[PDB]
Amino acid sequence: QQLMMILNSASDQPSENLISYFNNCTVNPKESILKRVKDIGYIFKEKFAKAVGQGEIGSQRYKLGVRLYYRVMESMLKSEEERLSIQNFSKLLNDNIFHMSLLACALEVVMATYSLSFPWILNVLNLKAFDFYKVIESFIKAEGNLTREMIKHLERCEHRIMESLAWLSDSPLFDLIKQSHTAADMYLEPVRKKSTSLSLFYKKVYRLAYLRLNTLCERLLSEHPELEHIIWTLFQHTLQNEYELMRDRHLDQIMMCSMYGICKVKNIDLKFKIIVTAYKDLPHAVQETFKRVLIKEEEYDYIIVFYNSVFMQRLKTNILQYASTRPPTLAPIPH
């Protein structure tokens, strides 16, 4: 409530100190930014009411998002003023996706505060999950007054993107994989040089996925504490080189298939039900991630089907190496 107070007692328009930043720009963004806000209010209020029904509360919801947005932007620009050139500073304040993403993050903070949850706001504004992800950490770092709970909600939005949404078909993420650390750096990347967006994203994916396997292996593989490290390499080599297997799927599905897979090739019998059972106890686990996965185009099925009919058909050649006289070398633990 400490933040919602300044938002409820603050102005509807950009501050004088923020107007300075606008005045220090080669191309001045003042008019592009506000018209952008005005236009977007309309798509937000329409799509809002068409979800709760009739009575218009959305206008008040949007106006607080707009106040948070202008506040967070000012805070963000104050550090980017030393980091960015005169020309990068202006390329940023004129970049639309950066702005959409920032405003979307403001709007989600209020929506979630007033518990249509994420990822509603992305589709409302037609914003790709991978673009929105680029703003979150710097958004947190730029709003000192976020509640513990608000921070925690945003980090959960970040993690849903990394686990599934950025892997949806049409995600620019795949463009970036084929082509081959702040929000402003990541939005200033030119469309077409090693990409900072993909590299940070992957450094964080690996750290997240591994935290989830490590919990899952301590409970179920106390008898094979050496197997944990062997499983991560299959998981990591999968994500790096066989990335297509995540298209429209969930990080946790590739995890579970790997730990079952290695224990099969090591002649360690542990059936899928014993792990799918252990997986549910994870904080935000949901049973459909293992109850319905993709087998064939526009087809859904149980998880063991995916393991037998999708996972091995690409990776059978790579897995048997794990038991030969020449087993593949183990992957570095993400720091």
Author numbering: 383 to 437, 440 to 499, 512 to 576, 600 to 611, 642 to 784
Sentences from the paper on this structure:
The pocket domain is the most highly conserved region of the multidomain protein, as well as the most frequent site of mutations. Protein X-ray crystallography of four missense variants reveals how mutations destabilize the protein fold and inhibit E2FTD or LxCxE binding.
Specifically, the tyrosine sits in a position to compete for the binding of a conserved I or L, which constitutes a significant part of the LxCxEx(I/L)-binding epitope. Loss of this known helix-stabilizing motif may be responsible for the large thermostability decrease seen for S751Y.
